[PDB]
Amino acid sequence: SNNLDSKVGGNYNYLYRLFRKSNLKPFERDISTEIYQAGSTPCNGVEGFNCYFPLQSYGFQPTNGVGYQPYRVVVLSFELLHAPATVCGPKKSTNLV
């Protein structure tokens, strides 16, 4: 998505979490902006030494390496529950004889 999610000067609208106390669980979403306590000293919502903002921008420029260029990703997960299956395929017809 270099054509869409990059611009001259660098697109910084896209962020990523750089720090976290633990790994995420499957399909866990963490959107917290709590100041990451890297050390033993509580941050009390104050950044500084061993007190970092957990998020950081992507440097998306049109001139960026393919590795560093933006890529749009959609993950499709198929929920199966004890409830009617409502998402089905097209099931194509044939002519009648």
Residue numbers of the site for other proteins (CB under 8 A)? 9-10, 12, 15, 18-19, 33, 35, 45-48, 51-57, 65-67, 81-84, 86
- Residue pair 24/32 in contact (Cβ under 8 Å)? The answer is no
* Residue whose CB is less far from other proteins, 45 or 89: 45
Beta strands 15-17; 55-57: pairing state: antiparallel
Q: Tell the smallest beta-carbon distance from residue 24 to other proteins (Å).
A: 18
- Summarize the chain as % helix, strand, coil (round to 5): 5, 15, 80
Q: Tell the smallest beta-carbon distance from residue 11 to other proteins (Å).
A: 9
Place of tokens 């998505």: 1
Q: Tell the smallest beta-carbon distance from residue 76 to other proteins (Å).
A: 19
The helix (H) or strand (E) run that includes residue 5 is helix 2-5
* Residue whose CB is less far from other proteins, 78 or 96: 78
* Residue whose CB is less far from other proteins, 24 or 53: 53
